[PDB]
Each structure stands twice: as structure tokens, then as C-alpha cells.
Amino acid sequence: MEFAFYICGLIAILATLRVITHTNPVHALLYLIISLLAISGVFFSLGAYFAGALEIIVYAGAIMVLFVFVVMMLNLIEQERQWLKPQVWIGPAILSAIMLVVIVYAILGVNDQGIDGTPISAKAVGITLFGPYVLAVELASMLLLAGLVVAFHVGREE
């Protein structure tokens, strides 16, 4: 379980690094799908089986399909490759590195008994979701309705 976790984490990091630097949008979305598949593998390593199934079904299988659809209908800044020359990403890269080093300083120093990896099934997640999480479920349906209304209002052609 540690083996799959570490290879999938490394694949996700590498794929994200190719995502944020690539020039072709379809290639970047393909690397993003690869990173999502790796993150699902990480979820399956931890025992969150429902989370991994949802990472493939919902994130890679719906959201990235929407991004892919938008890129295809765009038929697509690319030529100069601004983000490749160091005079553009000199600042943001070290800024993100400083933020990352402060965050991982906070990570190092906490109680860590390790993750057992015992599978938390989707049935227990359903009992929790439809037990002590009634208002999260109803208002999450409410939120998705809001997003649907907004995206139809903005994205229709006329």
C-alpha cells in the first residue's frame, strides 16, 4: 500500500509539473487526467475506496471531459511562450516555493501515528452522509443547482 501510494504521488507531481508548463491545451488536459488517475490511486492506497472511485468517475470522467469539450470547441499567446523564459516565472516560482516550505515546516512536527489503511467503505460514508450530515447533503444539492443555473445563464449562445 505504501508502494502504490509513493508511485502514484510521484506520478501526480510529475504530471502536474507538465500541466502548468505545457503550451498545448489538449496535452495539458491529458497530463491533468493522468494526475487525477494517480490521485485516485493514492486514495485507493489510503483505504478511501469511495474517494478513489469518485476521483475517476467525477473528476476525470466528468470535469475534465468538460474542460476537454471547451478546448475542442475553442479550436485554439501560445506562440511566444511567455511562461518559459525565466524573467516571467522568476517571481511566482520562488513565491510558491517559500509558501510550500512554510507549509511543510508546519507539517513537520505534528503527531503522526501512521495511516492504518483499513478500508472505509462507501456504505459507512453513506451512513455518515445520510446520518449526521443532512444539511451538507441538501445544501450541496442546492449549491450544484446554483452552479447549474449560473453556468447556463452565462454559457448559452443566443
Binding site: 501526480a12 509539473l17 478511501a48 511567455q82 511562461w83 501512521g114 455518515t128
Partner: protein, 100 residues
């Protein structure tokens, strides 16, 4: 057997990668892609935290996070389609006239 610290650090790495991808790109599409990276990293961190304690709450927060990610991706791609159909240009620095 897996440390919580390593999963949290992996989520932090993906979060800061999404943040710098959000900043450095003039194209709005790559900005939306970086936003998706950041929110997926946050959801991953919640899954790691929930799986460490043996609780269902991490996957529940993951479900709420991906609901948010789906809705925000929908709205952002609608706005990107509007920008492309009204300006024929996805340069985000051209959308800058309000200032002062």
C-alpha cells in the same frame, strides 16, 4: 504504515504547483486548470486527514470539495466561453480597464 505527514506534503506540493500555474499564465484556460489543481490538492489533503483518523468525515469533505470543483469548473468555463465569443482573445491582461 503510510505517514500522514507525507500525504499532507504531497497535497501541499500539488497546491503550490496549481498556484504558480494560476499566476504565470496569461491564458484564462490555464488559470482555470490551475484552480482545478489547487482544489483537487485541498480535497486530497482532506482525504489524507480523514483516512488518518479512521473517520468518514474526510471522504465527506472530499465529496463537498469535488461538488464545489464541478460547479466552479462549469462557471469558469462558461465565463471563458463568453470572453472568447465577445473578444476572440483569451488574454487575461487585456481584461484590465477597471483601475485606480
Amino acid at each position: 504504515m503510510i505517514p500522514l505527514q507525507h500525504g499532507l506534503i504531497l497535497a501541499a506540493i500539488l497546491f503550490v504547483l496549481g498556484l504558480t500555474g494560476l499566476v504565470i499564465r496569461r491564458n484564462l484556460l490555464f488559470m482555470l486548470i490551475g484552480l482545478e489543481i489547487m482544489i483537487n490538492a485541498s480535497a486530497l489533503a482532506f482525504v489524507v486527514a480523514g483516512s488518518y483518523w479512521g473517520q468518514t468525515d474526510g471522504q465527506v469533505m472530499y465529496i463537498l470539495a469535488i461538488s464545489l470543483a464541478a460547479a466552479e469548473a462549469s462557471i469558469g468555463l462558461a465565463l471563458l466561453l463568453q470572453l472568447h465569443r465577445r473578444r476572440q482573445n483569451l488574454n487575461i491582461d487585456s481584461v484590465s480597464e477597471m483601475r485606480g
